Amino acid sequence: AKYTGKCTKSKNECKYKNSAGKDTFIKCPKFDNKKCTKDNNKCTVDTYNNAVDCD
Secondary structure (H helix, E strand, O other): OOEEEEEEOOOOEEEEOOOOOOOEEEEOOOOOOOOOOOOOEEEEEOOOOOOOEEO
16 A cells, blocks of 8 residues: 655655554655655655666
8 A cells, every 4th residue: 555745855754654554654765756855845755666766
């Protein structure tokens, strides 16, 4: 089940909801598209293969 939330550009961490209903914080990629280039921005998480997309 894909998740959606926000992300921080200060520590590059995506905030989503794990497969249960809580607050999970992971580390976004350092790519040039899936990286967190904005604080409190919006990022999508894909547990299907750990494919985080920050922007």
